[PDB]
């Protein structure tokens, strides 16, 4: 007579690593590092806007591509490689900070500033921003002299933020192709555009000169911005070469912005996004993209880390 104790085993166990050995055979094991990617932007149940050809900063200035995005509202914002912040060539000082601001803004909310103008013109346009005919940024005003070579009266405009949240103010300096064209637009003399607030004091001057041929133009437009505190007032003192703001932008709520090149899919749900798709996983680690954003597992160098979920597999000799 005899009774025996023992444990189970299989002819098909899996190798794992421990403190003392590399590659012991256990009965069962599971993966802890996620490598499966879903090549779509899983946006099921999320207010999503696909900026497409419209650059994120453009939504504040409003080039034609952003005409449908002047007052968007979203929980998830997607930037595309074909996007563009400008129609007339230019760029934003502190552009990436503004992008990071708008990505989590939940959308924007425009509001008229009420800038009335005296003895100038306010309908400056161009063929780089074509809306039917030669047009301009929908949220801006291209101010120049009345006729040609005429003087620009030294003007001062002010705007009080009568709301409870900071107001995104964006203006623009125009660098002409030459001092002759700068005179043709705003008159002779060195123009000065000073901007003031309760915590802002910068000042700007145009830089006429010859540049490349971006979008058909050799002139440029510097875009500048500042955040206005509640009950605070912005003051613009200018004498030419000034792209005046027509409407302020107020942040709606909160959101998250990603950059991607894959299509939107409202069928799957995901919180971890990267440019290649969505990481739908419950594993604690991932080896897909180190710059993944959202609520993600931690990125690790290793492609696989097998966690043992069974005992040691001693083969039946």
């Amino acid at each position: 007579d005899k009774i025996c104790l023992g444990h189970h085993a299989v002819s098909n166990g899996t190798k794992v690593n421990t403190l003392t050995e590399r590659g012991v055979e256990v009965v069962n094991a599971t993966e802890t590092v996620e490598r499966t990617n879903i090549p779509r932007i899983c946006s099921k149940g999320k207010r999503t806007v696909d900026l497409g050809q419209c650059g994120l900063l453009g939504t504040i200035t409003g080039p034609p591509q952003c005409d449908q995005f002047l007052e968007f509202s979203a929980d998830l914002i997607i930037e595309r490689r074909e996007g563009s912040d400008v129609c007339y060539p230019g760029k934003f000082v502190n552009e990436e900070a503004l992008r990071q601001i708008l990505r989590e803004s939940g959308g924007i909310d425009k509001e008229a500033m009420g800038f009335t103008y005296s003895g100038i013109r306010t309908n400056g346009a161009t063929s780089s921003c074509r809306r039917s005919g030669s047009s301009f940024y929908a949220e801006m005003k291209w101010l120049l002299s009345n006729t040609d070579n005429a003087a620009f009266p030294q003007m001062t405009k002010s705007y009080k933020n009568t709301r409870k949240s900071p107001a995104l103010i964006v203006w623009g300096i125009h660098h002409s192709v030459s001092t002759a064209e700068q005179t043709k637009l705003y008159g002779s003399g060195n123009k000065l555009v000073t901007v003031g607030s309760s915590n802002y004091q910068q000042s700007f001057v145009p830089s006429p000169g010859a540049r490349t041929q971006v979008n058909g133009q050799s002139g440029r437009i510097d875009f500048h911005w500042l955040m206005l505190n509640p009950n605070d007032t912005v003051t613009f003192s200018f004498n030419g070469a000034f792209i005046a703001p027509d409407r302020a932008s107020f942040l709606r709520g909160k959101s998250m912005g990603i950059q991607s090149g894959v299509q939107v899919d409202a069928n799957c749900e995901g919180d971890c996004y990267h440019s290649g798709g969505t990481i739908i996983s419950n594993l604690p680690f991932q080896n897909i993209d180190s710059r993944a954003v959202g609520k993600c597992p931690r990125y690790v160098k290793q492609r696989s880390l097998l966690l043992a979920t069974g005992m040691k597999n001693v083969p039946e000799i």
Partner: protein, 162 residues
């Protein structure tokens, strides 16, 4: 068990395999199996937990950020990547060692349970079996399995045969 596992035990982790007179039989022990399973699933539940922390973009793969802040960002991200890789590999290795060791500990718990359950009516062959020095039919084996074996019934005969 000392140097072999039972590939035939396909309905449980641990179990009893005996032979007396009616032949050779094998059954699975539910208690120890469920203990080890509950511990391992405890580990799984601990390590699957979702992190509720959201991280957003701080650089840009379409328009490269300024070079200095970009190198600081890349430097920090690579440092944190090293930290999480170390934590991941160390975590998995440690948890694996503790898992194998806890399975072994459960096997030892079952074996010692049977040893103290039989008292002086058996001896240890040295390979995970109990030599019973008395007649032990299927009802006696099943009495050991369901933890109801009374050693006083066979004491005189077992010691007398030993």
């Amino acid at each position: 068990f000392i140097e072999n596992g039972w590939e035939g035990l396909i309905d449980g982790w641990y179990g009893f395999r005996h032979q007396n007179a009616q032949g050779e039989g094998t059954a699975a022990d539910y208690k120890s199996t469920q203990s080890a399973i509950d511990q391992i699933t405890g580990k799984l539940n601990r390590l699957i937990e979702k992190t509720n922390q959201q991280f957003e973009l701080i650089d840009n793969e379409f328009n490269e950020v300024e070079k200095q802040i970009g190198n600081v960002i890349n430097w920090t991200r690579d440092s944190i990547t090293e930290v999480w890789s170390y934590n991941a590999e160390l975590l998995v290795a440690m948890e694996n060692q503790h898992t194998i060791d806890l399975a072994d500990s459960e096997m030892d718990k079952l074996y010692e349970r049977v040893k103290r359950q039989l008292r002086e009516n058996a001896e240890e062959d040295g390979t995970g079996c109990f030599e019973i020095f008395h007649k032990c039919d299927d009802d006696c084996m099943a009495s050991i399995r369901n933890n109801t074996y009374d050693h006083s019934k066979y004491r005189e005969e077992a010691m007398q045969n030993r």
